[PDB]
Design a protein around this ligand. Sequence first.
Ligand SMILES: O=C(O)c1cc(OCc2cccc([N+](=O)[O-])c2)cc(C(=O)O)c1
Ligand SMILES: O=C(O)c1cc(OCc2cccc([N+](=O)[O-])c2)cc(C(=O)O)c1
Ligand SMILES: O=C(O)c1cc(OCc2cccc([N+](=O)[O-])c2)cc(C(=O)O)c1
Ligand SMILES: O=C(O)c1cc(OCc2cccc([N+](=O)[O-])c2)cc(C(=O)O)c1
Ligand SMILES: O=C(O)c1cc(OCc2cccc([N+](=O)[O-])c2)cc(C(=O)O)c1
Ligand SMILES: O=C(O)c1cc(OCc2cccc([N+](=O)[O-])c2)cc(C(=O)O)c1
Ligand SMILES: O=C(O)c1cc(OCc2cccc([N+](=O)[O-])c2)cc(C(=O)O)c1
Ligand SMILES: O=C(O)c1cc(OCc2cccc([N+](=O)[O-])c2)cc(C(=O)O)c1
Ligand SMILES: O=C(O)c1cc(OCc2cccc([N+](=O)[O-])c2)cc(C(=O)O)c1
Ligand SMILES: O=C(O)c1cc(OCc2cccc([N+](=O)[O-])c2)cc(C(=O)O)c1
Ligand SMILES: O=C(O)c1cc(OCc2cccc([N+](=O)[O-])c2)cc(C(=O)O)c1
Ligand SMILES: O=C(O)c1cc(OCc2cccc([N+](=O)[O-])c2)cc(C(=O)O)c1
Lengths: 141, 141, 141, 141, 141, 141, 141, 141, 141, 143, 141, 141
Amino acid sequence: LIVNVINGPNLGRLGRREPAVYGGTTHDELVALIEREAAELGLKAVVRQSDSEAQLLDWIHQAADAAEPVILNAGGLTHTSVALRDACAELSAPLIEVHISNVHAREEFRRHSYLSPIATGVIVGLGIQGYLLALRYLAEH
Amino acid sequence: LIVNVINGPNLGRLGRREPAVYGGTTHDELVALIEREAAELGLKAVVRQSDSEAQLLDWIHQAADAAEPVILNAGGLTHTSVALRDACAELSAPLIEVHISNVHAREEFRRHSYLSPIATGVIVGLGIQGYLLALRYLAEH
Amino acid sequence: LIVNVINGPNLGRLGRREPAVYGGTTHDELVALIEREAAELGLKAVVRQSDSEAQLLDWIHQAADAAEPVILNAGGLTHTSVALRDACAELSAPLIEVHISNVHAREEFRRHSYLSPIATGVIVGLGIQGYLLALRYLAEH
Amino acid sequence: LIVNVINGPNLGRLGRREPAVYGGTTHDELVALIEREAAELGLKAVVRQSDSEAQLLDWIHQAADAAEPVILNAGGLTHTSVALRDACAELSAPLIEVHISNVHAREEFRRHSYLSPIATGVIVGLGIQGYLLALRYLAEH
Amino acid sequence: LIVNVINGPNLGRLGRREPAVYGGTTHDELVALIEREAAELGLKAVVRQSDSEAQLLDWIHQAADAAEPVILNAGGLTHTSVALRDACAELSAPLIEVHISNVHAREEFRRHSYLSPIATGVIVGLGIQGYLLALRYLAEH
Amino acid sequence: LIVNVINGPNLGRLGRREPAVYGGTTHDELVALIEREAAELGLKAVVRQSDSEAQLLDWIHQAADAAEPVILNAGGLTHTSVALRDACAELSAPLIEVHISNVHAREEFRRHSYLSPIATGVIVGLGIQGYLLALRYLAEH
Amino acid sequence: LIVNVINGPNLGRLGRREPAVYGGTTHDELVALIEREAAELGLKAVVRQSDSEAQLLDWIHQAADAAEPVILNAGGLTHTSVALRDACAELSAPLIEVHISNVHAREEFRRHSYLSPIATGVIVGLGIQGYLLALRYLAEH
Amino acid sequence: LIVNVINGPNLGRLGRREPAVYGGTTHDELVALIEREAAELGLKAVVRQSDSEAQLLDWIHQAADAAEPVILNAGGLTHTSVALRDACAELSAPLIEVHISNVHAREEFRRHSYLSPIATGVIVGLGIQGYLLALRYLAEH
Amino acid sequence: LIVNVINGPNLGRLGRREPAVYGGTTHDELVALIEREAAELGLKAVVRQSDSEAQLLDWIHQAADAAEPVILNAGGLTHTSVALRDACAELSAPLIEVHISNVHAREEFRRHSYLSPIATGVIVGLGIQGYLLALRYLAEH
Amino acid sequence: LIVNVINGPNLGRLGRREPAVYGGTTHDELVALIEREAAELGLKAVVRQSDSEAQLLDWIHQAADAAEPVILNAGGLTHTSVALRDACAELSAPLIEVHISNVHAREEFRRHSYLSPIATGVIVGLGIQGYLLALRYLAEHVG
Amino acid sequence: LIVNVINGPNLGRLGRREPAVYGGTTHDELVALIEREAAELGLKAVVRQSDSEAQLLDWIHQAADAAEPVILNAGGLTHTSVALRDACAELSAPLIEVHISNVHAREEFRRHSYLSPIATGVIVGLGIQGYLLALRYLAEH
Amino acid sequence: LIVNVINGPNLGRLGRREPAVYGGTTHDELVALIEREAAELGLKAVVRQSDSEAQLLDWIHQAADAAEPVILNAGGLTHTSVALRDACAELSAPLIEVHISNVHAREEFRRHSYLSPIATGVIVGLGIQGYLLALRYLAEH
Ligand SMILES: O=C(O)c1cc(OCc2cccc([N+](=O)[O-])c2)cc(C(=O)O)c1
Ligand SMILES: O=C(O)c1cc(OCc2cccc([N+](=O)[O-])c2)cc(C(=O)O)c1
Ligand SMILES: O=C(O)c1cc(OCc2cccc([N+](=O)[O-])c2)cc(C(=O)O)c1
Ligand SMILES: O=C(O)c1cc(OCc2cccc([N+](=O)[O-])c2)cc(C(=O)O)c1
Ligand SMILES: O=C(O)c1cc(OCc2cccc([N+](=O)[O-])c2)cc(C(=O)O)c1
Ligand SMILES: O=C(O)c1cc(OCc2cccc([N+](=O)[O-])c2)cc(C(=O)O)c1
Ligand SMILES: O=C(O)c1cc(OCc2cccc([N+](=O)[O-])c2)cc(C(=O)O)c1
Ligand SMILES: O=C(O)c1cc(OCc2cccc([N+](=O)[O-])c2)cc(C(=O)O)c1
Ligand SMILES: O=C(O)c1cc(OCc2cccc([N+](=O)[O-])c2)cc(C(=O)O)c1
Ligand SMILES: O=C(O)c1cc(OCc2cccc([N+](=O)[O-])c2)cc(C(=O)O)c1
Ligand SMILES: O=C(O)c1cc(OCc2cccc([N+](=O)[O-])c2)cc(C(=O)O)c1
Ligand SMILES: O=C(O)c1cc(OCc2cccc([N+](=O)[O-])c2)cc(C(=O)O)c1
């Protein structure tokens, strides 16, 4: 059983700036933690990142066909993209929205997401571990 | 290392009237589940439930004074109580807000929480595992 | 066949100022006015008042477990308690909300209710007779 | 004592649609039970319905001139018409707003009423019986 | 030289009945006042009153086709009626909107007019004389 | 197969008004255009225009009882009338809202419609053509 | 009786810009116009302009002490000044707000006025003749 | 006439999933359909889909160079994209906005379009036939 | 006279954290100060604190029947409780609202209070001497 | 030593209108009340009224320059003036905002103040005595 | 070739306050800088400061008559003053608006300007150099 | 000293139309102009334009990693992209936001900017000169 982990705009920058807020782990190292954690839970995680909204939609589409779970952190698109929301609405396996930082402790405009109404759940503010916790949710379901 | 699991109004009624939105598990069964996960994780958890705001606050102060982490499902109070929030703001250890259902998929007034901004992070929509995941997060921090 | 009449905050002050907005019947006189009147309809009314939201929540739970109708004048909590609305949404028997004054002719904030969307219906501005007309509806559904 | 029962636009269609929100009773059947209930209290009920705003204003003026009480369900116009509001402001006898369906459980725009603030009282969501309870209140004053 | 004076809903009940913030002048006394004055100024006023939007529109289409000035007191329709606005936008002679009372010293929703933006001008809160002043404007333009 | 085309307040004056907003075709040539093009499609079009709300409702009621499709251009009432919306909600055959102008390129208030949420589909801003297009959809279903 | 006509910010620029919106006759022409027209009606008019909120307030207080009516055109300050509303609110003799241009036909922020709710009435859009029509009102009271 | 029919994000998924809103027709079936009808009207329909805003604007620009008309279903980008709006704003030939679903009958956010204000007209909720009717408009003009 | 000082939620925590804002005096110390200051002024102060809204309601009812002045710091209940407000609305003797911190300097929601409108006056942000000044003012009447 | 008490637009008309919203004391009587009162506390109050925004700004600047506290009742300007707010931001000595009436009991627009946020504290609805209790606050915090 | 540089309230306090929000340079050093920079560009800068709206309106009037360009830094009035907006709307030469600090980075209320819509453009957050850059625009036109 | 001049969506269409608002200079000309003007100031300007958000971000990410100053006109993405805002938020050298047109003199939605708050300064409406002026600011920093 394959799980798709999908990071959107700016997540490629992980650990290259703002260590307070997002932490000092890099994207590459995050891919590795997630694959490791996955394996130890009997899952197979494909972790991709893109700054491109088309590419993200493509990936969502593909999970919709394969019927795979998705853990999605879309960064900035969370608050702005209705298209992403529509592509994710087509998913029949679970969708777990994840944010590293606590968006509620930030600008007003970050407190709203088009994705959460259509997601199974949302993990916000638990840092990098939100991904591994989101896997545990899936291995358990 | 003690974790405080606190649940607000109506959560005593888990599993009884209402399935479908809140799951089939009862508050007794959830208590047993947290006891088992606690053990696995190698920490202790004290699960307490009350319909009364004044009781919740008293629990929160005690946690504040014992520097203990809190997992908090304040139920309807999440949306309305500034008092609970001010009590939570004192917490020197991490505060994890939990909701069983996805509040983002329900009436629009449920999409504002007075606790989220002062919490470490928030888990929503992951049903009862919501609590277990949060414990695990605390076992790692 | 039992009917629960439940009065929230400040309603134990009925009859002690305001002349005026609320009538001159005290809360004791009302209690018994309801009881006589439920009786002449073949109903058995349990009349209860409390200033404690927590106490009101426990009453609603019981009505919910017993499948009995409720007549709720929540007082102040009508505009403010999401927890009270969640407890009520659980009732399977009819729920009638009641206000003694006409909330629509007073402060704007009194015009929104968290309860009304989940009641069977709402009676406003008919003064004390509002409770008696709710009994009448219950006698007939 | 004479009481005017005035139904505005679409009330003609009662019991012929969605019945299932408004009930299965026809406008004719309503008139009948309004008129029997009138009888049992010593009142004369004059029940009137029109789709026209001007007709309703007219009936309202004549009740203002006669000083007779009014039970009004303005239907759609409740949410939209100031003139209707300015018309009823002139009534010196009591005015009861009645809605058949519980308008707080439907669309947002159904929740504001221009007539509520100027009415003696409002009865909502008790179905057809709303009318009968409105008569009963008038009997007693 | 023809000026049309058109009164909207509830105006047929000037100082009868509603005195109140509108004076002691009846609609009939007003017709005479406006006639006497208009003649005093070299104009013929035609003064018509109706509780009916469709009737008002009819009157306005006719003044558009005749190209005669309109002094309109739309009453409640001022605030709710787009059709009336659209009717009046085709008037090529001057349009003066008049209100006897000062609509700005009352409820919030009266402080908005669909007509004002397409009127030549607006006179408000100067009573009966509102009309006379309007005539005296027209007699110069 | 009978189609009811209904035109609301001010459409009587089409092509006697503002060319290149609503364009130079009169109401009568429109009727003729609609009746010809309807037959070409093996449909019978009954076209009517009224400035009276109650008269439009009457017609809607009729098309509901007869189960006939309705093409409605409600004029101003589009933005103002819950009663009209309530009427059309009862239609069991398709309802197609048509505006001659592009309502979205005008005043802000024109961008809201009480009718669209309850209509099959909406055609906006294609001029008179939009009526024929609506016929064309119906002919197919 | 002595009437105070008070002109606010930018009114000394009358007739030297925006003749399309504000007319063409200068502030001087205006003073003499109003003066002559007041004489013909049996009043004495004292007309002043200032760009200074402090000075307008000084004149308003004076009017208050003498119990003289005011015709005020606050210019820009109409929309923005609470201090001016407060000063005007103390005048026991009538106060008429006048605007030269049809404010409801311009930018939206022009449709709000702090002064209107405390005036006796308002004249808007009638050009320069607004001042003279307000003279004509005061001559009657 | 070459007409460019442009489809935005998620429209590639037409047919696949899922048809109470949107229908049973795949994106390719629709290309075929738009092509035949365009031909049978004497036009050449270029029909392209992209999940990529940049790709969408590249096509609009080209259409703007060749002065060709555009029929646009921008999907979710209708609700969010000023860039898309600015790109369309330089078309000289017509722009018809089309939505297969009736956007007014869903989430409140869908009822806003950055596009509608700069389109000539808009067709919503007529289905696949939506494209053909726009094609027919273009044929007539 | 007896003055009632009533502190609500989270005020027992005074001085024992967040001293930047509240600042350093504990509630016991505050009790003494207030008593010493009340006796030096010739008043008897009863100081009471509680996290229980219903307990706060009870103390106000008592002061209402006693017709005694009340000094109230409701804590977070200030921005949230209609119930507390309605209870104080009944007080016949003066009501001072106190806040230790400057609420207008913090989160936006703390800027609004349901008690302010019904209170004689409010002291905000003068720290703990707030209570003393309110006593000072009560000695003066 | 020295406290500035500054009153904004219309306060010069105190007690010439709607008493019992304000109530019966004139501005001059208020000047006497404050001065005597501040002296009993061992302070020196300078009291000033102006309807002119620019004059209040000028007075605020000198208070800022002399590191003297301001007790301020800006009247109408409380609700509308960003110029005043910005002059006031620059006081480092205490700033107490006063309102004679209870603004929360009146029209909605009166319940927002551009000054509250940059003020030390605010006193509202305690009438003329609001100024006196502000003085006593300063007096109790003389170091 | 004369350039008017007009600074509003508080700007006389430059550099004698917050060396970090507005730079270290005083108003006098600014007047020197601007007049210098203007010479080597071939212009005459007249730099003026006032804390008084009337004085600012006066200066603006004069530029409107002299038909001279204006670089305006209104200070706090930028956000609150229609009177000043209306004065500037007269100018025929360029009007450039300057803020030393980035007003978008501060309080929300600072983000709205009555001036901007009638300016040639706006320069914000570039410090004292904003003025020199505006001189370069005017030198080039 | 390298300076990144980045241009967003639709900016490739400069000069190729709408000259009234954007100028008649084309994008290539802008590039040459900027490069040559930066060089006089002893800067190396890298001008780039793309309709792809992903591309724009790549460019921002590189500037952040090189600590190079950036001049940004995000075009439409200015009002909608949180992603881009977040890319920009990590620039450690200066960021000047630039718009050719005055955004405050146009549609409402153009007056809000996601980028403005995180920028050093903004230049609006100074035409193509805005870019040049932005180079001068950076010349001194
Ligand atoms: O909406 C947000 O506030 C938001 C944006 C968002 O975009 C990703 C991002 C934004 C800025 C910097 C980084 N980064 O240096 O990895 C990543 C991420 C997150 C999150 O994962 O907590 C939250
Ligand atoms: O309004 C909420 O956000 C809310 C309320 C809420 O009330 C608690 C509740 C728990 C168990 C049953 C009920 N119920 O039978 O209405 C209510 C719970 C939750 C949650 O955990 O997702 C959320
Ligand atoms: O029954 C009501 O109309 C009612 C009662 C209610 O409880 C207040 C109250 C009830 C009975 C007496 C008093 N009183 O004598 O101070 C106060 C509150 C509200 C409300 O907030 O809208 C409404
Ligand atoms: O706008 C409403 O909320 C509304 C409208 C309203 O209009 C009358 C109406 C509308 C649609 C259908 C019917 N009908 O079938 O009687 C009647 C009635 C009622 C009501 O009595 O609950 C409520
Ligand atoms: O809603 C209004 O602002 C309004 C309504 C309005 O409707 C006419 C009307 C309303 C109530 C009573 C009367 N009347 O009989 O005098 C007439 C009139 C006027 C007016 O002329 O000031 C104003
Ligand atoms: O603003 C509207 O909502 C509106 C009003 C509206 O009112 C009818 C109407 C108004 C003014 C003139 C005409 N006409 O051309 O006769 C008709 C029509 C239309 C339309 O079909 O686009 C739109
Ligand atoms: O009298 C008016 O209509 C008026 C005048 C007014 O003062 C502006 C002004 C008046 C006279 C001349 C000019 N001018 O030639 O720049 C400007 C402002 C306003 C307003 O803010 O709506 C209204
Ligand atoms: O947000 C919209 O209004 C929207 C989005 C939209 O995106 C296309 C789309 C979205 C979700 C699913 C599909 N699809 O499976 O065909 C297509 C299309 C349409 C439409 O043509 O009605 C409307
Ligand atoms: O947020 C408020 O409105 C609020 C809450 C509030 O609750 C009391 C409180 C809240 C949080 C901490 C403490 N405390 O550590 O004494 C006390 C007090 C005050 C106040 O006195 O200004 C203001
Ligand atoms: O913003 C207010 O409502 C306001 C205005 C205000 O301006 C002074 C003022 C306004 C109206 C009358 C008087 N006066 O008779 O001094 C003074 C003062 C006060 C106050 O001290 O409560 C409050
Ligand atoms: O409130 C503003 O937006 C504002 C006010 C404003 O008023 C003048 C001012 C306010 C506070 C301090 C100073 N100063 O000593 O330069 C000046 C200036 C500026 C600015 O130049 O960015 C901005
Ligand atoms: O430079 C600008 O002011 C600008 C450019 C911009 O890109 C639009 C554009 C630029 C150049 C040409 C065209 N065009 O020919 O449609 C359009 C958008 C916006 C904006 O959203 O306010 C602003």
